[PDB]
Amino acid sequence: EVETFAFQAEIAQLMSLIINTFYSNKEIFLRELISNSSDALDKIRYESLTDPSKLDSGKELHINLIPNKQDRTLTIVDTGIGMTKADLINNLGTIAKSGTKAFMEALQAGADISMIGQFGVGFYSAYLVAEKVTVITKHNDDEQYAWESSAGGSFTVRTDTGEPMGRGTKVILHLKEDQTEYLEERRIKEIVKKHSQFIGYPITLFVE
Numbered sequence: 121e122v123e124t125f126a127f128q129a130e131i132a133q134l135m136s137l138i139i140n141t142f143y144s145n146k147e148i149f150l151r152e153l154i155s156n157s158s159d160a161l162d163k164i165r166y167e168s169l170t171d172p173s174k175l176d177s178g179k180e181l182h183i184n185l186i187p188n189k190q191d192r193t194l195t196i197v198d199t200g201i202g203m204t205k206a207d208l209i210n211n212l213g214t215i216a217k218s219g220t221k222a223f224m225e226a227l228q229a230g231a232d233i234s235m236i237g238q239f240g241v242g243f244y245s246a247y248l249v250a251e252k253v254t255v256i257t258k259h260n261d262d263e264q265y266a267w268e269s270s271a272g273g274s275f276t277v278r279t280d281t282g283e284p285m286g287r288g289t290k291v292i293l294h295l296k297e298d299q300t301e302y303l304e305e306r307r308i309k310e311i312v313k314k315h316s317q318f319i320g321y322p323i324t325l326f327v328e
């Protein structure tokens with residue numbers, strides 16, 4: 121079964137701003153997704169200290185960047201804490217609402233789109249380069265889910281029947297036709313070096 125949900129008004133407004141505002145510095149989407157992966161990895165690592173059984177779903181703490189020119193996708197994989205069904209549907213959208221209001225107020229005041237991460241809504245910067253975003257996630261206390269949205273005010277959540285992940289999150293970016301530069305090895309390496317050189321987890325850039 122595929123469940124369809126409406127984004128809260130502020131999130132739909134945020135997504136429309138990201139998709140419609142003329143802003144050439146699109147490359148910042150990668151640092152935002154890597155930062156979310158790094159934060160998710162910090163969470164599981166901290167949780168594992170009081171409960172070692174939380175790493176029974178995988179001991180390796182890493183980030184993989186997987187470009188696919190045939191499917192026109194850039195996948196960001198992490199072995200972080202993952203997200204529950206409640207996180208995908210309600211929890212994160214609720215925390216994102218306040219961050220969204222503050223960000224849109226800052227943009228009106230003179231701030232730029234690159235500052236999105238300071239408002240904890242950096243995940244939505246994925247819509248700078250992607251026409252559709254698929255999020256495959258597995259949290260220790262829940263099942264594997266697939267979240268998906270092409271914006272337009274709605275998202276879907278379904279139980280994932282694909283390849284089991286153990287634990288973590290896969291962000292599949294279905295790139296816009298004119299954003300294929302983010303599938304190029306040299307381009308991804310340049311972006312990682314410029315904005316994510318001090319991330320405390322190994323970042324492996326897969327090759328085609």
Ligand SMILES: CCC[C@H]1Cc2c(C)c3c(n2-c2cc(Cl)c(C(N)=O)cc2O1)CC(C)(C)CC3=O
Pocket residue numbers: 156157159160198200201202203207208209212213215216240241243255267288289291
């Ligand atoms: C609590 C701060 C971190 C948030 C930030 C965040 C927000 C805010 C939202 C999402 N994320 C988010 C994304 C990813 Cl891909 C990861 C990860 N790699 O584990 C962790 C995330 O949680 C994804 C969403 C639930 C589909 C929509 C949303 O509003």
